[PDB]
Design a protein around this nucleic acid. Sequence first.
RNA 1: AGCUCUUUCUCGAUUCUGUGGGUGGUGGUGCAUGGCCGUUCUUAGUUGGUGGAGCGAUUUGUCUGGUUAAUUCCGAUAACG
Length: 207
Amino acid sequence: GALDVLQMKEEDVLKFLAAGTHLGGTNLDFQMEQYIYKRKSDGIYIINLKRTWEKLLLAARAIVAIENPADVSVISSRNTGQRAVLKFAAATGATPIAGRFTPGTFTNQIQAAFREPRLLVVTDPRADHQPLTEASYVNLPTIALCNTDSPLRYVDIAIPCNNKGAHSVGLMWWMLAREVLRMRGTISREHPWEVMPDLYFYRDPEE
RNA sequence: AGCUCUUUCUCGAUUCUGUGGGUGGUGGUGCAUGGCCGUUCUUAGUUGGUGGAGCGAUUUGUCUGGUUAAUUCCGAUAACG
C-alpha cells in the first residue's frame, strides 16, 4: 500500500540483505518473471525486494480476514521450516503440521486426522505438493513462499523469496507473524518487537 | 413244509373275497440332492468400508530395498483403519 505507516524501513532492508533473501536460482519460470530485477554476470537471478513487501502485506491482509484463528493451517515437510511453522503457530493461533502430511487428511471424512480449514499456508510449492493438489477438491484458498524456479499451479498469493534453506526461511515466517500481529492491533507499528528473528532459524552448529 | 392229494376231526367273527389305497426293497440314478471324507495345496495365501485413478471390465491399499520357516518384521508410501 502507499501509506507511510506501511512503508518498508532501512532496518528491515538490512535484515533482508544479511539473510540472502534477494538471491534466487540459476533458472527462472515464465510465471515468476515480473518479480525479478536482473540476472548477474555469474548465472544467478536477483529477486526485487519491494515486490516481496507488497505480496507479504497482501498475504497478512488475507490472514487477518479470518474470524477464528484455528481455521488457518500451516505446513512444512522440509526440516528448515519445521521450527519456523511451530513458532508462527505459537505467536498466532493457527494449526501446524510438521513432517509427513497423510494423503486424504482434507478429503477422507472418516479419518482419525481429518480436518476442514478456511486458509492454507505452505513453505515450498515443489516439496509441499500433496496438500496443494488435495486443496483442489474442497474450495480452499492458498498462500506460498516462491523461489525463481517454483511451479505456480494452485497458489493464489505467491511471496517472492529465497526458500532454499537456513536464515532466509526462518526470517520470512518471523516477519509474517510480526505484520499479522501489528495490523490486528496486538503490537506496535513503531516500537521494536520482543521476539528475536534467530528463534525461527534451523540448526546452526551448537558449540 | 398239512406245500399239495385222499380222509374227517378242530377253532369261533380275530379272518376270507372284489375294488381303491398302502408297505417293504444291500432295486436304478453320486450327472437330481443333504451329511461326511479326499484332493487342488504344506505352500503363504485371501477380503470389505471410507478416500484416490479410469467411459469401462478393473486397480491401489496387498510395495523398490533389507530380514524371516511365514503377506514374519523393519521401513518406504495416495492411502487410512
